[PDB]
Amino acid sequence: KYENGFINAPVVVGPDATVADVRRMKNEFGFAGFPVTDDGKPTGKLQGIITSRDIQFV
Amino acid sequence: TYRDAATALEHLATYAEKDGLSVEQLMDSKTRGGLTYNDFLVLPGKIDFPSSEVVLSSRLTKKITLNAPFVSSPMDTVTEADMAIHMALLGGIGIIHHNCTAEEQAEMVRRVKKYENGFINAPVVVGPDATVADVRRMKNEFGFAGFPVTDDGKPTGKLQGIITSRDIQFVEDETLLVSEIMTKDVITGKQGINLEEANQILKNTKKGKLPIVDEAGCLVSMLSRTDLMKNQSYPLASKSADTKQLLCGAAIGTIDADRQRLAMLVEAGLDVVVLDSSQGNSVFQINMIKWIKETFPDLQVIAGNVVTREQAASLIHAGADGLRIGMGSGSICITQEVMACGRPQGTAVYNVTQFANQFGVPCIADGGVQNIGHITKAIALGASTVMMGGMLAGTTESPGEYFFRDGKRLKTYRGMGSIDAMQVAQGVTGSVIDKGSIKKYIPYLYNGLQHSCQDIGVRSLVEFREKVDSGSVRFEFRTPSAQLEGGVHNLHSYELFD
Amino acid sequence: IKWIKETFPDLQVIAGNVVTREQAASLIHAGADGLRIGMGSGSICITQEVMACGRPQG
Amino acid sequence: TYRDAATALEHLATYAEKDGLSVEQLMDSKTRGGLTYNDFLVLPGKIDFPSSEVV
Amino acid sequence: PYLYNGLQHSCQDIGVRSLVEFREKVDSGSVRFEFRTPSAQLEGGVHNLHSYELFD
Amino acid sequence: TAVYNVTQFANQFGVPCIADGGVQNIGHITKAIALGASTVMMGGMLAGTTESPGEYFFRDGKRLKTYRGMGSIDAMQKVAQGVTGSVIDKGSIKKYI
Ligand SMILES: Nc1nc2c(ncn2[C@@H]2O[C@H](COP(=O)(O)OP(=O)(O)O)[C@@H](O)[C@H]2O)c(=O)[nH]1
Ligand SMILES: Nc1nc2c(ncn2[C@@H]2O[C@H](COP(=O)(O)OP(=O)(O)O)[C@@H](O)[C@H]2O)c(=O)[nH]1
Ligand SMILES: Nc1nc2c(ncn2[C@@H]2O[C@H](COP(=O)(O)OP(=O)(O)O)[C@@H](O)[C@H]2O)c(=O)[nH]1
Ligand SMILES: Nc1nc2c(ncn2[C@@H]2O[C@H](COP(=O)(O)OP(=O)(O)O)[C@@H](O)[C@H]2O)c(=O)[nH]1
Ligand SMILES: Nc1nc2c(ncn2[C@@H]2O[C@H](COP(=O)(O)OP(=O)(O)O)[C@@H](O)[C@H]2O)c(=O)[nH]1
Ligand SMILES: Nc1nc2c(ncn2[C@@H]2O[C@H](COP(=O)(O)O)[C@@H](O)[C@H]2O)c(=O)[nH]1
Ligand SMILES: Nc1nc2c(ncn2[C@@H]2O[C@H](COP(=O)(O)O)[C@@H](O)[C@H]2O)c(=O)[nH]1
Ligand SMILES: [K+]
Ligand SMILES: [K+]
C-alpha cells in the first residue's frame, strides 16, 4: 500500500467527524488526504475532501 | 526515647545551617580550591510541580534572551549555517566560526537569517521569458521552487503571476517559457498591511505564498506558508521580534582586518558578535569593543575568553554586553599545558559571574561541558548560558563528512588553535563519535535540564539563580571515590537517548 | 504517604529516596515508617551525571 | 538592579584580595602541601603588548 | 624556538614583558595562581575524544 | 562451492538461485553471481541501517544495533543454531544500496 496507481478502499471520513478525529487518523495511517463520504464508508457518496492544509492551522 | 514525627519540620530550626554547603562555602577556597564541575553535586530539594512547568529562559547578552541556555561553539567542526539554524529553531543560538573568508562567513550568516521570514525582503523572482530549464536551475541553486513572476525579473517589478514546484514538476519540454506555464490569477496583499493581517490572508487561501504588491501592482514583499509551519513546529525558536528571522551569532578576531569582516557580517543581518580569543583581556580586544559600540551600536558584543574577576571588570568597563568564560577547559584544547595559563572551569564561572552578574552582564560557560549535569552546575555557579563544542560535533547538522575508524562512525573535531585550523599550537586535531540529529539531542538536553531543576526544587533558571545566591540551594563536594560511585561502576558491561 | 496511613493503617511505609536532612524531615512529618537513602550511588545508576543531583552515599 | 558598567574597575577595590591566590598562599602548606607543577595554574592578566616583545 | 616562542606567549597571557618582570610581579602578589584538583587537571588536558593527533 | 554446484544443476531447469549468507561486500556479490547465483541475500550488511528495525544503542564507544540469528534462543523464544550479537550503524540504504 506504500505506492499505488489506483488506490483500493481509500481511507475516508464522515462529515460529522471532528478535526481531533482527523488528526488522530493522520498519526495512525499516516497520511492526511481523506475524501469525505456521507456515511463515512469508502463506497459512500462523495461530498468533499479534507487535506493537511485544511487542518494545519485549525 | 524518640521524638514525635509531627515535630520533624519544627526540629530543623535547631540546626545552625541547612544540610550541605552554600555556594559560598563550596567555592570558599581554602581548602579546597580550584575545583571543576565533577568535584561537586547539587543537593535535591522539595518538589511541588511537574518538570514540564520548568522555564529555561536565559540571557545571552544584555538585550538578547533565549528560551534555552544552549550555544553552539564557533568552530569549523561544529557551527556553520545548518548548525546555527537548528540551534535557533530549538530555542538556543549558534555562533558561526571564522576559519573562513569574510565573504564565506557573511554568506553563512545570511543563510541563517533568511531561513525563516515574516515578510520576505527582496524575494527571488523570475521573468516571463525564462524557461523551465532556468527555473529548475534556480530551484537547485537557492533552492526553493516558489517564484513570483515579474515583468523585468526584478523583485521590484510588476507582478504577472507565479510559478511553483507543482507547475514545473512534470513538464517534459524544458524550453517552455514561464509565461506559458505560470498561474496568472494570483491572490495578493496590499502594501501597508501588517504581518498578522497578511498571515491571515495566507492562511485563508491555503496557498504556498502571498505576494505583497503596491497600488501600481509592483511586488514589494512576500509571505510563505512554510514560515507559519516553522513557527508552529518550533514555538521556542530564537527570533527577532520584528522580522521573525532566526537569531544568528558569529565569531571574529580583534585585528584591524576584522573590522571589514564584521561590517560584512552586519550587512548579512548579524545579531550578536563574539570576539574570539583564548585571552580576551587585551588592549587589542578592548579597542575592538569600543569601536563596535560606536560603529554598530545595535550589535550585541560578547567579549572573552576570561576566567578572572579582573579580566571581567576590564571588558565590562570596555562595554561588553556579555562574557565568554573558559580557558583550557576545552575538550580539544591544551592552553593550560602549553601556556601554564588557565583556570578550573567551575571556579572560573563562579568568580567571574559573582562579579559580572552585579552589572547585569550575562556570562557563557565555555568548555568542559559533556552532559546535562555539567549544564546544571555551570548555571548553578552563575552562568547564564552554556557553550558546547564537542557535544555537538558529530551531529548531522554539524559540518563534517563522516568517516569510519576502529569500527566507529566518526567526525573530525579540531581546536581552533591547532596548526591545521590556523593553516605554537594551543589545540589539537581529533575525532568524535556520531550522535544523530540535534532535533532529538537538544530536546533531550532541554527535558533533562527541566527534570534537574525539578529535583532541585526550582521552577526556572531565574529562580535557580536566586535560590543559589540566597543559600537556599545546597551543594556537596565529591571525593574521587564519590565520583566513581556517582557514575556507572562495578559492571561487566553497559550500554540515555533513543 | 498520607493516603496510605489512613487507608491501610497497618501497612508499614518506606519513603524515599532521600539524601538530605530536609528531605527526611519532610517525609517523616508525612508519616513515613522508614526511609530509603541514596541518590546516584547505584551501580547501574546515572542520576548525578544526568541531573547534577545526588550525594556521596556515606 | 544592576551596577553601571563604568564602575566596573572601581568596584574591584571593594574586594580584600585579587582573584586567585598569591604564590605565598599557594605554597603556604598547610593544607595543602607538597605540590608539583601539575597541581596548579597561573591566572591570566592584562595584555598590552605583542608576545614578540617578551624578553 | 618553539619552546622560546611558547614561553613568550605564556608571559603575554600572564601580562609580563620579561622574566625579570615575571619574577617581580609574582613576589609582589600581582601574579595570581590557582590549585588544580585531579578533575581540573583532566579537564585542563585533552579529554573526551575518540582519538587525537603542537609543532611542525 | 555450494552456489556453484547447486546452480550448475538448477540453471538447467531455469530455476534462479539466491546466494544467502557470507556476503559482506561488493566483491562477494560479484563472486556469488560469477559462481551462478541470480541474486544475493544480505542480512548483516543491511542490519544497522536506518530502515532496519528497531532501535540503536551505544556500547564500547560505537553506535550499534542488535543482530541475531533466527535460530538463536532469544529469537525462538519470541538446541540453538544461531546467536545474538550486534552490528555497527550504517545509515540509510537510500545511500548504501
Ligand atoms: N498513479 C500512478 N501511476 C504510475 C505509477 N507508477 C507508474 N505509473 C504510470 O505508469 C506509466 C509508465 O510508467 P513507466 O515510466 O514505464 O514505469 P513503470 O510504470 O514504473 O514501469 C506512466 O504513466 C506513469 O505515470 C504509480 O505508482 N502511480
Ligand atoms: N491518502 C491516502 N494515501 C494512501 C492510502 N493508501 C495508500 N496510500 C498511499 O500513501 C501515499 C500518501 O500520499 P501523500 O501525499 O504522501 O499523503 P497525503 O497527501 O496526506 O495523503 C500515496 O503514495 C498513496 O498511494 C489511503 O487510503 N489514503
Ligand atoms: N521561495 C522563497 N523562499 C525564501 C526566500 N527567501 C527565504 N525563503 C525561505 O524559504 C522557505 C521556502 O520554503 P517553501 O515555500 O516550502 O519552498 P517553495 O514552496 O519551493 O518556495 C521559507 O521559509 C522562506 O522563509 C525566497 O526568496 N523565496
Ligand atoms: N488561482 C491561484 N492559483 C495559485 C495561487 N498561488 C499558487 N497557485 C497555483 O496553484 C498551484 C499550487 O500552488 P502551491 O500550493 O502554492 O504550490 P506548492 O507550494 O508547490 O504546493 C500551482 O499551479 C500554483 O501556480 C493563487 O493565489 N491563485
Ligand atoms: N509569517 C510568519 N509569521 C510568524 C513567524 N513567526 C511568528 N509569526 C507570527 O507572529 C504572530 C504571533 O505568533 P506567536 O504567538 O509569536 O507564535 P510563536 O512564535 O509560535 O509563539 C502570529 O501571527 C504568527 O503567525 C514567521 O516566521 N513567519
Ligand atoms: N586555547 C584554545 N581553546 C580552544 C581551541 N579551540 C576551541 N577552544 C575552546 O574550547 C571550547 C570547546 O570545548 P568542548 O565543548 O569541546 O569541550 C570552545 O568554546 C573554545 O573556547 C583552541 O585551539 N585553543
Ligand atoms: N542455521 C541458521 N541460519 C540462520 C539463522 N539466522 C539466520 N540464518 C541465515 O543466515 C543468513 C545471514 O547471513 P549474513 O548476511 O548475516 O552473513 C540469513 O540469510 C539466513 O539464511 C539461524 O539461527 N540458524
Ligand atoms: K551511579
Ligand atoms: K583542555
Numbering used by the authors:
A (entry chain A): 115 to 172
B (entry chain B): 2 to 424, 446 to 517, 520 to 522
C (entry chain B): 290 to 347
D (entry chain B): 2 to 56
E (entry chain B): 465 to 517, 520 to 522
F (entry chain A): 348 to 425, 446 to 464
Publication text:
The enzyme IMP dehydrogenase (IMPDH, EC 1.1.1.205) catalyses the oxidative reaction of IMP to xanthosine 5′-monophosphate (XMP), which is subsequently converted to guanosine-5′-monophosphate (GMP) in a reaction catalysed by the enzyme GMP synthase. The reaction catalysed by the IMPDH represents the rate-limiting step in guanine nucleotide biosynthesis and hence IMPDH is an essential enzyme that controls the cellular pool of guanine nucleotides, playing crucial roles in functions such as the immune response or cell proliferation. IMPDH forms tetramers in solution, each monomer consisting of a catalytic and a regulatory domain.
The crystal belongs to the space group P4 with four monomers in the asymmetric unit (AU), each of them located around a quaternary symmetry axis that generates a tetramer. GMP is most probably the product of GDP hydrolysis with time in the crystallization conditions. A direct consequence of the interaction of the Bateman domains is that it brings the finger domains of the monomers from both tetramers into contact and arranges them into four pseudo-β-barrels that further associate around the fourfold axis, contributing to the stabilization of the interface by burying a surface of ∼5,000 Å2 per monomer. In our structure, we found three GDP molecules bound per Bateman domain: two of them (GDP1 and GDP2) were bound to the canonical nucleotide-binding sites of archetypical CBS motifs, whereas the third one (GDP3) was bound to a previously undescribed site.
